[PDB]
Amino acid sequence: MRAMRLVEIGKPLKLEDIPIPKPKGSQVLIKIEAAGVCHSDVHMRQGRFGNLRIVEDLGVKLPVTLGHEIAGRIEEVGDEVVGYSKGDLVAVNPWEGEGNCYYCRIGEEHLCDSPRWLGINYDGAYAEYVLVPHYKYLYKLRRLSAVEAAPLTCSGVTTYRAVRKASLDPSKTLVVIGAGGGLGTMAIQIAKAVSGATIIGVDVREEALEAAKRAGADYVINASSQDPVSEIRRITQGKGADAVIDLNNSEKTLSIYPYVLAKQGKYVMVGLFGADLKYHAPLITLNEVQFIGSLVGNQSDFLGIMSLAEAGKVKPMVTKTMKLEEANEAIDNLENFKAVGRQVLVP
Amino acid sequence: MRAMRLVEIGKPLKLEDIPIPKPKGSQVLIKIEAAGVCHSDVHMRQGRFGNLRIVEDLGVKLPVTLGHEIAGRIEEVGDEVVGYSKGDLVAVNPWEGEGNCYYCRIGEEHLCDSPRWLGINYDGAYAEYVLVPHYKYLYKLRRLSAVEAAPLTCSGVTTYRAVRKASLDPSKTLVVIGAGGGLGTMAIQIAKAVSGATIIGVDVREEALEAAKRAGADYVINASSQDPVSEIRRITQGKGADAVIDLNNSEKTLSIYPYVLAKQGKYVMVGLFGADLKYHAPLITLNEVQFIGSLVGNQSDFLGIMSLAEAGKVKPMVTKTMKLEEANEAIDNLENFKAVGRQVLV
Amino acid sequence: MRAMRLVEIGKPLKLEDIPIPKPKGSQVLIKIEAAGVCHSDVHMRQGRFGNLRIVEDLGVKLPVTLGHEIAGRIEEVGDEVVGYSKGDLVAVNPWEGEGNCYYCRIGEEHLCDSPRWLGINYDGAYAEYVLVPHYKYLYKLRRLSAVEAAPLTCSGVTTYRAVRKASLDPSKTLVVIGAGGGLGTMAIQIAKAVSGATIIGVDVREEALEAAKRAGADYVINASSQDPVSEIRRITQGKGADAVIDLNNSEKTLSIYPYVLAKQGKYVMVGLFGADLKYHAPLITLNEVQFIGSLVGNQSDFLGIMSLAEAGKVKPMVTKTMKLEEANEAIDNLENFKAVGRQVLV
Amino acid sequence: MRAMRLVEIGKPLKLEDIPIPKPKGSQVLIKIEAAGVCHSDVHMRQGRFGNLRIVEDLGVKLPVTLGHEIAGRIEEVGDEVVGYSKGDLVAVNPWEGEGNCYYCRIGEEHLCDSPRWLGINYDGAYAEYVLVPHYKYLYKLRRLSAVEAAPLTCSGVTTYRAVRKASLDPSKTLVVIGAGGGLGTMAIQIAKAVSGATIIGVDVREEALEAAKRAGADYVINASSQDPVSEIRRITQGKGADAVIDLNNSEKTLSIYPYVLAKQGKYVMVGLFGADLKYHAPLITLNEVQFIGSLVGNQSDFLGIMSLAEAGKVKPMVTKTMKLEEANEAIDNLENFKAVGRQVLVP
């Protein structure tokens, strides 16, 4: 089968011909009908998340098929599979754990000590087929097509979790940094659907802000032409933002936004652009500010976002559908900040 | 009345004689019997918390009587005061708000936009009497004496809230930095009394660690004669600490402990030594760690620590007492890191 | 000034002429522009909530002006009032506490031991003016008019708190009983605005269900012409409802819905029709279901619903307005179940 | 192997000779060194929990080996078992789920739609060996012996969860009904270890109250000689109890304690004596009281209580150790309210 794999860092993904997995036990073989392209793949290709080398520090073993936004039809199931039949259209939660470690026992499976992340350390969706370790990570689709559902397995579940960590309510204001991109449009839609908080979207491209508005942002700020700090201060009437979901965490964003937080404000750090957070400690203490890391999501988060989308409350903004072989072009678009919403590959 | 006030930044507190406040409405006048000495007064005297100037930046108007750990007896009450009488022994919650702003409405009074902090921007306990804006901030003392209860109004409520933010449970390990001081000894007693988590106390003086051990720490580590990272990793079997309550937040502590956090670990920042937190962002994201600021406490926190104390489940470790006029010496001891537990003035 | 007061239990509210309150300190005098009519006033007039007598049991002292959904303009302020001026349009939180008791300290003012409930044990909005104990209970109106905001101070805050207690999320289903009334229409709008859960509205009148559908219900069920159990089970695919907000709690509703709860399901009891909950204990234990009482709301709840409303995300459905003197007729409509949405007096 | 099984309701458990299970895959065969006796087995033997027949209504299929308080040594592991070796002394969490249903996905495994409860609908610990479905339900013991740990898997995890649902803090008072029994002594120790709340123990036997005190109760009330209502009112100075953990839920207890709740008080219903809760609805609404059901516990709860005990913070009060063949006598003792603390069988 065809597969776009990461064979060497700093080099484009290579199309290869590898065997189709054979499911056994509780595993499930899925024929891919949609594979979303995540900016995280830009970092993977470069082989690094900030100062962290995926191979040397994170333990990734090359080669590996990328693609962690997965949706397709069940092709074959193992002998222990129950409640799923061949032909079923499903979305797949790639953030899988083994079950015995501390993090799996408390329901934080994505933080497993021996993680099975499809598309990162295990073969992902940039292929004609993908082997899913356990059927419990599936979610049958009815209202959504594979193309519309795929982005939900990463950008969706990730921002759903981040939005929960933001602890929103009607009296609070949320600021999303990078609001026109893949996770940005998803975070905005979700915040608009599961809370009554005021949503402010921030980006640097005119097209990105149009995307943020289509996503439902109550207010948008172009940080290239406008003074983001002044605008956020004005909109919140001098109070500052009660929560900020930073989908960049770059030298640029971390030098600006951590300073527009209201007292008790929560700065949820999702982006992986790579930079150090330098912040005066007394500022953290005296203002009870919080810097919170958020990574993908657990089974509850996956269930939550899938339920919301399947109910028609939110829907990924897929702006382009391309071939599996165009994987390197889709990733380039993100690397060059030329895409809005989400791009999805179809084998 | 006698009163030790911050009259000039950088200079010792000055013994001054000012009018005795006259309570009206729901206000209450307390005759001070005990005033705890907090390290915060070292910063105050120096005129800053890190880069933040108390006057220009934090808006403190001098002169002001310091002292934010308050306990004494009611001397006089306003005409609207209910449920309290002259002579009543009480502890005072100094972190007061006005009630109308966003923060007061959600029950986070200490973060009021127009704060009324006794001992900070309003006159405190380093005097014969102290005026209390509302009787709602009082707590009748029964089991504890004024001297034993005074520290609860700051070191107690501050660490009670911090322990709460640490989200502890029996399977977690908590590390307390500065475990032998005023807040350190309280943080440990509270953590042991309101959770079943493993407690590791870290300090840099043999006696401080002994005070930490007595407070109830399961393990103690002297960072100045042994590598804390190795011990903490060993104790947690390589997992790291699920929570750290840093009562320093100095360049020294922030360069060590943030790196010993377990995944989802919470770094609660209470200390105000002054330094910049510096941490690689990808590490915060990939490990889902949290850096959380915690400041004094609200009325719920005050009630929690006073009830816990009056029930005899925790008790401030007062290692020495002295006169009001000796305020400058007590503060020097903290500045020179010469004390263990809490000092109280009378 | 004119005022409709509960002078005699069992008898209509009486038009009376009493002195106009004079505000002092932090008190504020509001000139009433809108007073919502709540079903609670049906109980009040009848003199009881279930078996609980408002006088003997609940301690209500007659006579008292009713009306707990308040909105109007500031007429006069006490000398200590800050941030408000004469002429300011505001909504009033009537569920007020004194601040010193356990409940006020933990931020649950509405459960104060010495409650100051405007329209219940203190004079309410069914009059030309109403005295407000503290300006902290006010909320400046910008987007909404007095008539549109009045209902938020009871039907809004009550259901906002109830929606919160329901612990909803996208994978859950909420069932609202009495979905076409004052609280019902609000509960649905709020549930839709602050969660992504599936909402099922149940009522017994075609128009009530239409009002429920308009409020935003995903499904509507007329319990008087179809079996609600079958529909709810079908809609939830046999799982049952994860939460039910019962705005009746009558022998009729309690004999049906508690049995349609999913495991861990939460039955939030708001309605005060009067009945006894009767459920086999082993079922509560084995299914981990919860029967939760919810009463009006605290300052945090008030802030939440007022902000949500002023942002235009929800809005009380006022289907009719009338004169203060018509108070007894508006209450009759609710008693006879003749209204949909909310009625407001001017 | 020997096994004490429930073969017919209303009749004593029968000693039988059944084959020793053969573990495969992720299963683990444990040689039982301790099996605690739970009052729940009194209800099982009678074949009913209140109005609920275990067979006709709950779906239990007879015969079945009882015993849900399990501890022993690993005898054999399946091929997929990792991190566990033969000879390891472990406690076993019997409240197991399948993983795919809603409740398993959100971390509430014990409420699984297709539960695997060892000792209830699957063979339990009243035997020489027990087959554990998955090694992730194990917890290695170091400080505790099997006899001291066994009770933790039901009375321990159940009361740990109930204590959490009670939402305690230093200013609150907890009242435990049935404080001298198995779950009673465990609830008291736990509340004393994980909260600073005031603990009041209530029972009807002098011996039961001695047990409650040894457990650490701050106050004890003998409901046979004293007026429980008056005492609770006096101790809480007229406020009432902020939380009540009822380990009976009988006609007797439900007619008394739901009426001594403080405003916002939580009545956590754990006991299964069988009775209907009849309570005036306006009382629930106007006082914001809560009636909360609590059943065993999930993997997080199990991890929590095991950590606490393994740390020496709490320890089951085993008052008697007897032979496997004495299973019917141990259960009779509970049925007749003649035992304090917990009884443990050793094959």
Ligand SMILES: NC(=O)c1ccc[n+]([C@@H]2O[C@H](COP(=O)([O-])OP(=O)(O)OC[C@H]3O[C@@H](n4cnc5c(N)ncnc54)[C@H](O)[C@@H]3O)[C@@H](O)[C@H]2O)c1
């Ligand atoms: N923590 C997690 O679980 C997780 C999961 C997925 C992706 N991510 C990370 O989130 C980040 C964004 O991912 P994405 O897929 O949405 O990519 P994306 O390219 O679609 O979005 C990036 C957006 O950032 C905007 N941007 C660039 N510089 C900016 C600035 N200075 N201020 C404001 N906006 C700016 C761009 O215009 C663009 O719209 C990446 O680093 C990715 O690896 C994290």
Ligand SMILES: NC(=O)c1ccc[n+]([C@@H]2O[C@H](COP(=O)([O-])OP(=O)(O)OC[C@H]3O[C@@H](n4cnc5c(N)ncnc54)[C@H](O)[C@@H]3O)[C@@H](O)[C@H]2O)c1
């Ligand atoms: N955020 C708040 O609400 C709040 C409230 C009160 C006090 N504080 C602050 O907390 C800090 C401590 O206050 P305190 O009253 O307990 O004072 P303290 O004098 O008791 O000092 C705390 C302890 O820190 C120890 N220490 C010093 N260097 C150390 C190192 N490198 N590693 C480990 N331990 C070290 C000292 O030996 C001492 O025992 C101060 O900065 C104070 O201003 C904050």
Ligand SMILES: NC(=O)c1ccc[n+]([C@@H]2O[C@H](COP(=O)([O-])OP(=O)(O)OC[C@H]3O[C@@H](n4cnc5c(N)ncnc54)[C@H](O)[C@@H]3O)[C@@H](O)[C@H]2O)c1
């Ligand atoms: N706990 C609190 O804080 C609080 C606050 C305000 C009002 N309330 C109470 O809530 C209840 C409802 O108040 P409301 O103002 O919305 O009044 P309402 O007149 O609008 O009545 C509510 C709805 O119940 C419907 N109904 C009647 N019988 C029904 C049945 N068998 N099944 C389904 N629906 C049925 C009616 O048709 C009506 O639409 C009252 O008992 C009131 O006193 C409680």
Ligand SMILES: NC(=O)c1ccc[n+]([C@@H]2O[C@H](COP(=O)([O-])OP(=O)(O)OC[C@H]3O[C@@H](n4cnc5c(N)ncnc54)[C@H](O)[C@@H]3O)[C@@H](O)[C@H]2O)c1
């Ligand atoms: N929900 C769950 O997860 C769960 C789990 C295990 C056991 N249980 C149930 O909890 C209950 C108790 O179990 P146990 O194992 O501790 O049994 P136990 O016999 O050891 O305890 C019962 C105690 O109740 C006391 N008691 C009897 N009548 C009383 C009264 N009127 N007032 C106060 N105390 C009274 C007895 O003196 C005795 O000490 C049973 O119904 C059992 O099935 C529930």
Ligand SMILES: [Zn+2]
């Ligand atoms: Zn794991």
Ligand SMILES: [Zn+2]
């Ligand atoms: Zn304020």
Ligand SMILES: [Zn+2]
């Ligand atoms: Zn009160």
Ligand SMILES: [Zn+2]
């Ligand atoms: Zn399941």
